[PDB]
Structures are given as C-alpha cells and as structure tokens.
C-alpha cells in the first residue's frame, strides 16, 4: 500500500503480542504511534505501559492507559517499537528521532523486543543511516576524535540538546560489519552516554510491513 | 613519615614528568593538590592546564596557571592524578571523591597516564574500595539490578547529584578479579554514563609514595 498504511498494518500486527494483564513498554515515533492507537483497543486488558517519551506517555494518557515510571517496573515482557535500520542479525540502529536514551534503557529492562516498522528500513549492513550518538558536553570533541579513528565521520546536531543535557553526534560513512564489536567500541569511549547500536540486545521479533503483508521474523 | 608528606613527595616527584611549554591534564583530591602546588612552581614554563575539577580550577587560576577547556584541546602528552585502588596491573578504581566523569575523559585525551598515590592504594585485587557508577536518574533501578547480577552490591548514594545531573551508585563486595572484562560489561549498560573502571586505559606510570621514599612503577 502507501508507506504509511505499512506502518499502521505494522502497528496493529504488534496488538498480537500485547498480554492481557501485563504492564507495556511503548516505543517513540511516527511507526510506534500506530501501535499505541492499537493498544488504546485494549485498555481496560491491560495494566499500563511504560513509555519511553513524552510524546508517547501524553497519547497514551490520552487514550486511558495508566503510565508507569521506569523506576516503578521491576521487569518488562515486551517492548514494541521502530527503528532507523536494522539488518538480518536483528541488529538495529536506532535515536536517529526522539528518546535515543530512554528507549535503549526500556529495551535493557524488557524480556522481548518486538521492532515495528516498514520495509525500507530493512538493510543487509547498518551504517547507510547516520549512527546517533549522545555524549556529555565537555567530551564532545574527544569523542568526535575517536569516533574518527573507528572509521566514520561524526557530524554534531547543533542547536540540540538531549533531555538529559547532552549534544549528539551523528556518525555518518561506517559501514558497521560488526554491529556487537562496534557498539562495545563506543559504549568504551569516555564521554559516550549511548550509542545507537542495539546489538548486544537487539530485536528478538520483527514485523516487516512489505506490500505482500507483514512478514514476521524470529529469534 | 606521615600519609599526608606521602602524598606530598609524590606529588613534588610527578613534577619531573611535566615537559617545559606543554599544557598539563591535572587530577583532583588531596594528592593531586600537592601536585598542582609543585606545578605552581613551573608557571611560565609550561602552557597551562586541562582541569578535571572545579576545585582543581580554582587552585591552578590562582596559581597563575592558565587552565584550558577540554574542548580547546586536541591532545595531551600527560594527566596527573591519584586513585582509589591500583593494582599490579596497573589499572585503578576512581571516582569515590569527586569528578568520575571529568577525570576519565581527560584521561583517554591524554597520551600518558601518571598515578600519585600513597602506598595505602596499592591492591592486590581491585574491589575492596566500593566501586563508583554515574547513572542516569531514569536507570538507577534497571543498573542497580544489573550489578548485583554481576555481583556486587550496588548502594545509592542518597543526596548526591554529579554536575551532569546524574546519581551514583557506589558497587561493594566485588572481586574484581577482570577489571577489563568488568569495565566492559558494566559500560555495556544502558543507563551508565560512566564505571570509576580505568582498565582498558591504565596508568602508564605509577609514583607511589612508601616510607622508604617513592617507588617508580612503568608499563
């Protein structure tokens, strides 16, 4: 259909996953929102969610669903959201948007990490879209520097600052064969608050919004 | 003679490692004060300094140093400062006292790493000294449950908030047996901005003050 009905078909193909009688973690952004109109249906079968943004929180508030802090959830069963790319490995790239931080933090607290999203942001190797960066301050420039030294070409969002203060560096050029092994030589990097790499823990489910459906990728 | 002249030898005996027209990576805490003293002493022979403290800033202003931001710098021949716990290997634990992140990211610009510490630091096997963890406020809970699955026993220090906003999380009863194994799961979380761990990056050289006088450890 229209790359956007790919998102909702997507975004509703997820309800699937929701258990009633549980607590959910709600992604951030265009692909998520459709999920969480989906979700709307079932409150009242559901405990509450978990959201990783105040645009997410607000609409779910809206939509009568009670949102729980971070720090009032000893776990997660799933936590469904999109992402900027992600290849065969279910490795993905992720904080091109909104929440780079919150949603990494969500996913750690989440047993199963179910990724929405269209086909295009199917690829064979992460790299082709900018890997995000969040980084304090005062360490911008020797990350810059580093991030140079592993291969891409780090470009500062000027004029932003993360929630949690911080700038963000956009790394552009890499062509990240090895998303675990470069997501560790990152997170090494003093300075680096979060890479936008979920390798070490990346999707465990995906629902592929391809013209032919949705197609549902596994383990 | 007296844990505090310890400190002070050592302090003195790092000035021999300061080059005439460079600028200086220095520390903070009681040791490296005794540092900054002796380097008072080569105002106008080197080019200033890159300050992990704003104590540390304050006392070099007034020494007549000029102190440069991390930012106004693209490298460092040296960085002086004290530890928490060195082992043989020498890699430390920092960050009890103040600035965790500030002195890690100084450290990976500076090309080497000179520790000055009384002998009292000296370990056979990091972890006896809790080991610090700056935090994201929003992941205190989800890192706080990380640890102890790594082993540890993570005690919040109530009251306190880095001047990047964040909380600590002081890790007790860990053999750190892998301090770089350790480093590297504990950055691998998301929600941590930085582990008191310097064991990927080390001390280059070590001055330890003993009794005896101060022994020169390298490598």
Request: aromatic fraction near 4%; hydrophobic fraction near 45%.
């Amino acid at each position: 259909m229209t790359q956007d009905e790919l998102k909702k078909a997507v975004g509703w193909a997820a309800l699937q996953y929701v258990q009633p009688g549980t607590i959910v973690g709600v992604g951030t952004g265009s692909t998520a929102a459709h999920f969480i109109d989906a979700l709307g249906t079932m409150k009242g079968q559901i405990e509450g969610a978990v959201s990783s943004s105040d645009a997410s929180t607000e609409k779910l508030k809206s939509l009568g669903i009670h949102v729980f802090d971070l720090n009032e959830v000893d776990s997660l069963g799933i936590y469904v959201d999109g992402a900027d790319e992600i290849n065969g490995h279910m490795q993905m790239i992720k904080g091109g948007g909104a929440a780079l931080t919150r949603e990494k933090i969500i996913a750690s607290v989440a047993e199963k990490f179910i990724c929405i999203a269209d086909a295009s942001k199917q690829v064979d190797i992460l790299g082709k879209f900018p890997l995000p960066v969040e980084v304090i301050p005062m360490a911008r420039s020797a990350v810059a520097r580093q991030l140079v030294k592993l291969g891409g070409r780090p470009e500062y969002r000027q004029g932003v600052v993360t929630d949690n203060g911080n700038v963000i560096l956009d790394v552009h050029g890499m062509e990240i064969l090895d998303p675990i092994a470069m997501e560790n030589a990152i997170n090494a990097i003093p300075g680096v608050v979060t890479v936008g790499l979920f390798a070490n823990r990346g999707a465990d489910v995906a629902l592929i919004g391809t013209p032919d459906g949705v197609k549902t990728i596994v383990k």
